[PDB]
Structures are given as structure tokens and as C-alpha cells.
Design a binder for this molecule. Structure first.
Ligand SMILES: [Cu+2]
Ligand SMILES: [Cu+2]
Lengths: 620, 620
């Protein structure tokens, strides 16, 4: 009966029925987004009213709508007509992926471009990329997708090995017309194939790898109740799933003695964008918001035991809605398991003669998604010592282009004539904090060097300083690796036995943030990505760092708009938004399929406990 | 027959015999350091001549000597008398540890200080700390150790919980004299105990942890031949061990097709220092060079199966010399095993319909050492994809002090009246490079942001630049996380199939470097720690960033002196010295025994291979 339970297939079908009966789901309508709404602040309202938020698209051109329904009472709470030119277009539909290639296949301009390159139209795949907002005035208010071509020689061929450069087209997916076809010139289509399962490329397979058996004879140490409530080594939380954000962690708390102490109310990857840095007009508009525009959760893969998740795994199979309101299950889309994590603590004392060693462990909650050529793994880890960590694993196939004759300062060569445009993968972790409760504050902590002189005659002293962020206008911070800058979230009203406010310290990887010029469209639409850390006052409707309707929005939505309210965040219900990402200059080693690369962050207890919380761990 | 084989007990006995025969090892002599010399460059000597280098201390006060012998020819190649007042004192002997407490036990000044604090001398442990170089004129030419006191209530009591602040003494361990006893005032000695094995503090042990079974039915995938030659998943290397540096990796190479391609000739942690940032006269002189002053390899722990190393482990038991030249085996001092490392590569393609997933693995080579209150784990990892990584794990018990009533800017409070002085743990990895051979060069790579305008009208472009470090004078570099700065070691004479010099990219963690004032004694003695990366031209006698003799040695040797030669490093035999470390502001969670914290670096192939090197990994 948990208010945080995963949505059932029945609830989805109930939303469908409510919408249809209300006359909001005609033949021309499509569900572009559907998700359950979290419980509002305050549980004083016995029996939670299960509500769902829905974005309804109209393939007829009619205005779309945002609808909220109660599956509990079978009613439509609200239905608001959207003006996309003002607030943004709805997320891209999977069924729209094919329309780009299909429409172009009958366009004379496109056909002429392909004929000139001697490419059989039946073998040309077209990637349906988001449009963004640029200098095309005729696109405002229109639902546009841009297409880039790749050649697939045969059904099982990897089209990514054969990009068709110097060509790009724009299509209005609703009116079903090709608005523009740009051909800047012919570029040879890379000839080598990139079929990583082809023996001629892989060569003889290795026979040297001996098996590694990971098992748990007595089963896992964690328990799963209510379908998604996890309890493991003092940790307690609920594993939620949203079609847009993917896996979401709720009510992260730690059992310290006789009390369950909250740490984070809600943790999620609220956005992830991949901005490309190639100035060619064929790709200079390319910026794909995996989360906001495509909805990464809907493309979650079914994870195979022994391949994707090794060991004793407990799966969760979330249900989402298809474009028509029918429930669709993502079988084994979420993996949960615990794993050994080396040494936790160790000391051999010369005076006491006592030799002490203890092992560490981590609870893993993960899912893997695929968006076109990219595949991303999202991993959340809980450690015995109280540490919380997130790790993203980027793999898949690199987005390609031709490698220019004469070289390039924005593309790397991965194969003869094959290029890989420079780009970044930037994530935004939204952490609705609740350190021992909702009354929290954030302090920026910098290392402080000291000058040799009075009080520091030997010049060995060094210190640290903490600055409380009191208002949102001063809560947009940048990293500073050189001064070991971190951010501490504490509760000024809850102190440890040393009379110090309890807290948690966020450690960032300090990777570069958005590189695009400050005046670029992407810098405006993905403003969150320009700074490492933002702190806002909690608000029900402030869900994503980029706003609710990212697709084709002019910019400034999300964080920049939230921060503009300049609200008090000193000892209040606050939310931390951490930006982190990878800057990718593709290597030859990334081709034909790339080895996983990683990025993330972690939070470690900072005077949260009265002493080490792992003194009760056995020797085993 | 391998000239990279581990030293044998016989070789050590042979060195002892040769030294004795030469009249260099009488009863007053002690072996402060003994290690095998790596073979010189180029296949000079027809056969391999095994040579050892030794530092001989004299307990009577006579001048020590540095000697090199050939165990093969039974001869002394060279023996030089050392002027310690100039070139530095020899490493501290384990037998000198107890000397400090013993001498102070009968000193009236020391006894009076303890009496003033109502402390029973029989229960006062004294830590033998390195002295460094400060303003004490009498210390010139004297072998000094400074002592800090801790109370041990009973045999198995953790003395670290009871520091005796406001008191420090200096001792000449050779003349057996207490040179000075400094008492700045009586501080309350913290009363709470820190016995992490006492049920009173641990409380009832958890019974919730289920077992995790990690086994290899068919044994490990790696082979060990010639005692220390490792071959695993295309990797080839020799595992060496030196009493000073600990585990050292030799001839790291990768089998690419039909050729064994070298990558790194020698990899080691050539120094590690722990500088304290408390300006109190009681500890302002404290800087412990675990590697250079104490010799970390000497204190390597015997690792227990199931506790220290889990899974199918292959052990190495290196042999070192004791203070008299007799061989001593460190049973199971080195652990070697392979472990699963999640997903290696993955892609589910929407056009080919092919779903592909491969798992990763890494070879692990490690050891764990203990120096007083600290315990450090040194880990080297080799990945299937060609990545090489080092990870240091810091744990043990924090060095304590009293926590001043009025608070402190350089000490944190761990328990009532118990303090933990701020400090850093800084390592120096010496990487004698050999990317496809010895003709190498280093380039500093920075991300390059571009301004919106002609050629970049949309302001989305971003690039990078590489700067070749041509001479040592320009090879002292700093990190720049903001611009994603990395360093690439390449071979200008060996190109991949795309006609680009093969290379490897070093990724640093970009943690703060030495914080001490540039004019401090430690900034001079640990000069290497003030910069993130140094590149030198290979030279036989340039082994450590701090020189051969660190104990009580001023600046003047090491990296700063090496770089002064301003040698050509552009396409030459070069060595990369990377500084990396942790800045520790102790938390309550670190008491009474600290959870492991980590730091390290890694190098990934950068155009070294002609495509991904793991296409031949099987699905199962
Ligand atoms: Cu990428
Ligand atoms: Cu420390």
C-alpha cells in the first residue's frame, strides 16, 4: 500500500480509459509522456490519491494537452491546452522515428542528393534527430525533426560505418512535408564496415578467458517488499521508474540505532544532453536531450542474466504506456544486487598487537538504455559506510561523419575517411535533499592555503573555509579542483554528539562543463550544463533543469527560471542539481563499438554519524 | 634466467657475504636499504650481471656507505663514504623505533612532563617520527627522531585515542641522547577509548550480511612463469618488489596480433609523503615520507585469503634483507588475481536488429603496508581494453592530538577533546615510458573553447590543442581540470594505420597538490609534490623524486635538480613523474578506525591500436 509503489499495468489502462471516456484520446491522439505523480509534501492526507501526468500529442496539428488524472477516483483533475510555440513541443514519439526516412524517400531533392552519390534509397537509413531552435523562422510552432543519412549495405550491417556527409534535411512530422534539404557537397561515404560480430573484423575469438563464478548460497542480504521497497545493511529506499528519467530513488534513509534517518528524499538524473562541437552546417545544430526530448526510460533494455547483470540478481519489470495508452512491460529492465567492494577498513597495530580487517560491499540499482547509436548504463550505489554514488557508463557506437580531406579541428578520424565529431555527454542529477529532515542548507567548502609568518612560522599550515549559500541568486556555483572545492548539505537544526550540524559532502569529478559559446542556442536551452552546481528552493512543478517541454523550446526554461525567483535556501526544503559529464574526442579505439567510459559523483557522510557507522560489521 | 626475476634469499645472503668479505659489514654495521639494480639500457653485458645496491648504516657513529655489488662476480663494484650532514641520513631502521620511548623513559625532563600530567611512564607509548630539517643547529650531522606521546591504558588498548598534546622530544638515536624536551603546556588527555573490537563500542555485530562466493572452477586466466612473469589477456609484464618502493611493474607490454608491443618499461610509486598542516610547535615539523624515509615495502602485510584478497588468488612472497643482511620472506605479501569489471561494451541496434554485450575484466596486483597508525593498499590494474590504472587505498587510524577548547582552523574534532590535525597523503608515480619502444614524447592536451562568429556562426564548436614538451625546463606542468587537461605520451616514430603517432593518455584525478607555503622546509624537501606532472630524460641514477637520501635531508636533490639539466625529451627515452594525493580534513566518521578512501590515476590507449582491441572477446 506504499504511495511510492511502481505503477501497475492496470493503472496505465485505467488512465487510458479515463482519457478516452473524457473524449481526450481520439484516433488522432498520442501519449507522448505518461507518469505517476509523486506524493505531495505532507502525508496528513490518509490514503494517497494516485495521480498520473500525461502529455497528449495530436497528429492532426491540433493543440496538444497536459492532463492530470486520478486513477483512484477515475477522474480528470485538469486538462490544459498547450501552445507549443511558447512553452515547447512535446517529447519525440518512437513512431515518429520512421517518418523522417519515409517522407524523405519520396522527396525529389533528397532523391537527387542520393542519386548523385549513387546510393540506393532502399539502403539509406535516416537518423531522426531533434531540431532545437535556430534561425529558421518557419519552424516556430511546427513539430520538426532533422535527418542525417547512413548507408546500410545489408539487413545486419552497421549503418554507422557509412555516414553520408554534406547532406541534411528538415521535416515537419505533422504536416508531413520536407521543409528543407541542404546539400553542401559530396563527401565519399566511408567504405569499411563496422560489423563487430563479423569474424573478419574480430578475428579468432579468445579462448583464454576462464570463468568467474559469482554466487550467493544463502541468497542476497537485501530484502524487497511492496514490490520496490529495498532494505539493505541499514539502508532503506524505494526504487521508482519514470519513462522520462528512468530509475528514480525515493526516501533514501539510513537506520542509525533506534531511528531511521533520512538523507535524500528523491534522487534522479533529471536531464542528459549530448551537444556536438562540429561547426559544419550539417551537424552544427545537433544537441540531443536524451532525457528531456526522447525519454530515456522508454528505451530501457531487458537485462540478460550472466551478460548484463552477473551474480545473484533481483529484477524489477517496470510498466510504461505506449503511444496509445496500452501498458507495456519492460521485462527485467532494472537490476538489483550487492557486490563485494574490497577492503572497508584495515589496521595492524604495533602497540596493541591487534590486526583488524573488514570487507566493504555496495548495493547496486541499475538499468541500461539505448537511443539510436548510443547506449547508457545508469548505476546507483549504496555503500556500507554511508556513501551514496552515481555512475553513468557510456558505450554503443559513436555518431559518425566523413573525415575531411585536409583534416579537422572538430572531428577525429577513426577509420579511412571516417570521422567522429567532438561532443559532450552532460548529465544533471536532481537531488531533493532531506538530511535528517527537510530543513537543509548548502555550504561551499574550499581548501585555504596560509602564508608563512606569525602563527605559521614554519609555513606548513593549511585550512578550509565554508560559505553558506543563503539565496538562489548566489547558489549557481562552479567547480574548483585546484582548491579541492566540495559542497556540504547539512541540517542546521540537527547536530551530532559534538554539537555540529550533521551533513553530507558532495564530491564531484570536476570534468569540464558545457563548452559552447555563451551566446549559443544550446547554452540557453541547456543552461544547467554551464555550471557544476545549482541549489533551488523545493517546488512541486520544478522537475527538470530544462523545463517540461524541452523539444524546440527557445531557451531559458528550467534552472535559469527557477533561480530567478531568488528564494531563501538557508535552512529550508531544498534541491541540489549537479551537472557532470564527459567531453569526448573519439579515439580509434572507440571504433567499431566503443569500450565503456564513465563519469559520476558521490556524497559521503560529513559529521552525520557520531563515529564510524561500520564498527558493527563482522569479520566473516 | 630472467634478469627481472625477484631477488632470492640466496642472493641476499650472497650480498651479505660479499660485504662481509670486503670488510664493509662488521658487527657495528646495519643494512638500512638493500635492493636489486635494474639492468642498464641496451643489451650491454653479453649475459645478465646481477647487481645489488645497499645503504650501510654504522651504529657507532662512523660514516655510512653506499655500495653496489655483483652477486655474480662476488665483487664490490663501488663503495662510497657518505657525508650525511650534506647528502642526507639513511632510512630509519625498524630497530631504532623503540629507542625513542626507551631513552625518554629515563630522562628527567620527560618524566617531569609526564608527572605534570599525572601519567604513568610505563603506559606512555612514544611514536618514532622522522625529524626533517628545521632550525635546530645541534641536529646537523646527527641521526634524530622526534617523539610524540600516546597513553595506552592496557596491552590491547588503542593508544591513538589518548594523545598527550603540548609535549614533544627530540632524540639522537646513535649517541643515545635526548637533545630537547619541549613542553608548551598541559592539555587534557582524551578519555574515551577507541577500541574498535570492543563490543561496548561496536555494539552487537550485524547478522544481516549473506556470503558472496567468488570462485574460478577452471582456475585463473593468467599464467605466472619464472616466478614473477605474468601473462594475462594479451598483457605481459614482470612483477618486481623493492623494500623501498614496494611492488614495481616491469616491461608492461600488450600482444597486438603477432607483435609484443611495449607500453611502460617500469612503473612504481617512487615516493609518498604525509605533510601535516597544524601550526602547533608540537606537530608543525611533522612530514612522514613513508617511501623515502621508512621504506614501505619493508612493512608489507602478509595478506590473508578471504579477508585481504578474495577469490582465486595467486600469491608472491618477496624476500628482503633484515638489518643484518639475513634474508627475510614476506609471506603472501603480494596478491594477484583477476576480477569481473562490469560491462565492457554494449549496443542494441535499431536498424541491424543485433544486440551485443560483452563484459570487462581487470588483472589486479597489490600489497598492503602499515607504518605506525597508517595502513596503505597499493593496487595496479590492467584492463581488457588496454587501460592501466593505479589506486591507493588509505585507511588505519588517524593521527591524533588534543582538540583545543576554543576550536581550531587546522584540526577537526573526532570525539570529546580529541582532535585530528589536517594533513595530505601525496604520492609520486614514476612511469619510465616505452610506448612502442623508447622513442617517446609528451604532449599536454587542453580543451579549446571557440568564440561564436565566422566559421562558427552557431557558437557550438569546441576543439583541443596539444603542446609538445621539448625540453625538461618546460616539462613541469600543473593540472587544469576546467579545461580537461591530460597528457599524452606518444612515439613519433611509430604510427597507427591512420598515420598518427601511437599513444597513451594519462588521466589525473586533479586533486590539490602540496598546500604548504612555497618557502617552507616541506615545500623544498617535497618539491615534487608542488606540481602535478614532471617529465625527465631517463638516467640511471635518477630513481626517486626526492633523491636517494630523504631522511633529514634538505632540498637540493630529486626532480628539481634533474630538470635543471634541461635535456631533450622530444622523441627520447623519457620518464613521467605524476603527483597525486588526498587532502584530509578528518571527519567523525573516520574515528575510531577509518573507512578506506582512495586516489590514483590511469592511462588509456590513444590511437595506440588500429581499432578497438577487444573485438575478439567472446560472449561467454
Ligand atoms: Cu561520446
Ligand atoms: Cu589521512
Amino acid at each position: 500500500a506504499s504511495p511510492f509503489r511502481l505503477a501497475s499495468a492496470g493503472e496505465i489502462s485505467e488512465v487510458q480509459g479515463i482519457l478516452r471516456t473524457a473524449g481526450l484520446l481520439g484516433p488522432e491522439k498520442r501519449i507522448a509522456y505518461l507518469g505517476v505523480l509523486d506524493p505531495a509534501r505532507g502525508a496528513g492526507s490518509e490514503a494517497e490519491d494516485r495521480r498520473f501526468r500525461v502529455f497528449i500529442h495530436d497528429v492532426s496539428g491540433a493543440r496538444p494537452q497536459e492532463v492530470t488524472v486520478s486513477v483512484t477516483n477515475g477522474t480528470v483533475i485538469s486538462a490544459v491546452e498547450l501552445d507549443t510555440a511558447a512553452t515547447g513541443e512535446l517529447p519525440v514519439l518512437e513512431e515518429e522515428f520512421e517518418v523522417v526516412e519515409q517522407l524523405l524517400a519520396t522527396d525529389e531533392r533528397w532523391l537527387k542528393a542520393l542519386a548523385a552519390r549513387n546510393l540506393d534509397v532502399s539502403k539509406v537509413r535516416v537518423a531522426p534527430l531533434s531540431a532545437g531552435v535556430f534561425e529558421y523562422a518557419e519552424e516556430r510552432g511546427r513539430r520538426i525533426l532533422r535527418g542525417l543519412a547512413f548507408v546500410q549495405d545489408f539487413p545486419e550491417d552497421s549503418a554507422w560505418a557509412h555516414p553520408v556527409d554534406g547532406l541534411v534535411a528538415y521535416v515537419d512530422v505533422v504536416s508531413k512535408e520536407v521543409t528543407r534539404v541542404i546539400d553542401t557537397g559530396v563527401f565519399p561515404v566511408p567504405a569499411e564496415h563496422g560489423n563487430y560480430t563479423d569474424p573478419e573484423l574480430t578475428g579468432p575469438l579468445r579462448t583464454t578467458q576462464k570463468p568467474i563464478s559469482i554466487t550467493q548460497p544463502e541468497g542476497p542480504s537485501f530484502t524487497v517488499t511492496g514490490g520496490n521497497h529495498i532494505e539493505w545493511e541499514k539502508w532503506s529506499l524505494d526504487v521508482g521508474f519514470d519513462v522520462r528519467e528512468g530509475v528514480v530513488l525515493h526516501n533514501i534513509a539510513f537506520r542509525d540505532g533506534d531511528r531511521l534517518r533520512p538523507i535524500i528524499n528523491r534522487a534522479s538524473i533529471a536531464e542528459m544532453v549530448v551537444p556536438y562541437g562540429d561547426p559544419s552546417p550539417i551537424r552544427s545544430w545537433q544537441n540531443y536531450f536524451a532525457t528531456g526530448e526522447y525519454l530515456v526510460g522508454q528505451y530501457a533494455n531487458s537485462l540478460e542474466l550472466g551478460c548484463d547483470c552477473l551474480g545473484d540478481i533481483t529484477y524489477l519489470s517496470p510498466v510504461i504506456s505506449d503511444a496509445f495508452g496500452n501498458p507495456r512491460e519492460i521485462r527485467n529492465g532494472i537490476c538489483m544486487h550487492e557486490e563485494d567492494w574490497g577492503i572497508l577498513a584495515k589496521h595492524s597495530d604495533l602497540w596493541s598487537g591487534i590486526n583488524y580487517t573488514r570487507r566493504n560491499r555496495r548495493m547496486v540499482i541499475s538499468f541500461f538504455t539505448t537511443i539510436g547509436n548510443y547506449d547508457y548504463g545508469f548505476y546507483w550505489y549504496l555503500y556500507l559506510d554511508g556513501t551514496i554514488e552515481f555512475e553513468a557508463k557510456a558505450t554503443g557506437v559513436v555518431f559518425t561523419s566523413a573525415f575531411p580531406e585536409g583534416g579537422s579541428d572538430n572531428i577525429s578520424q577513426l577509420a579511412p575517411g571516417l570521422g567522429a565529431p567532438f561532443h559532450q555527454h552532460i548529465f544533471s542529477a536532481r537531488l531533493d535533499m532531506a538530511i535528517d529532515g527537510f530543513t537543509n542548507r548548502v555550504e561551499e567548502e574550499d581548501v585555504v592555503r596560509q602564508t608563512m609568518g606569525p602563527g605559521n612560522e614554519r609555513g606548513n599550515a593549511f585550512s578550509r573555509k565554508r560559505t553558506v549559500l543563503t539565496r538562489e541568486s548566489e547558489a549557481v556555483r562552479e567547480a574548483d579542483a585546484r582548491t579541492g572545492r566540495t559542497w556540504i548539505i547539512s541540517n542546521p537544526e540537527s547536530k551530532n554528539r559534538l554539537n555540529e550540524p550533521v551533513g553530507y559532502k558532495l564530491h564531484a569529478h570536476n570534468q569540464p562543463t558545457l563548452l559552447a559559446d555563451p551566446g549559443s542556442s544550446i547554452a540557453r536551452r541547456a543552461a544547467f550544463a554551464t555550471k557544476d552546481l545549482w541549489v533551488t528552493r523545493y517546488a512541486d512543478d520544478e522537475r527538470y533543469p530544462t523545463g517540461d517541454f524541452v523539444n524546440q523550446h527557445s531557451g531559458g526554461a528550467g534552472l535559469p527560471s527557477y533561480i530567478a525567483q531568488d528564494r531563501d535556501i538557508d535552512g529550508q526544503d531544498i534541491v541540489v542539481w549537479h551537472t557532470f559529464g564527459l567531453t569526448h574526442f573519439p579515439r580509434v579505439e572507440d571504433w567499431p563499438i566503443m569500450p565503456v567510459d564513465t563519469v559520476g559523483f558521490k556524497l559521503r557522510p560529513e559529521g552525520f554519524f557520531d563515529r564510524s557507522p561500520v564498527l558493527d560489521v563482522p569479520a566473516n
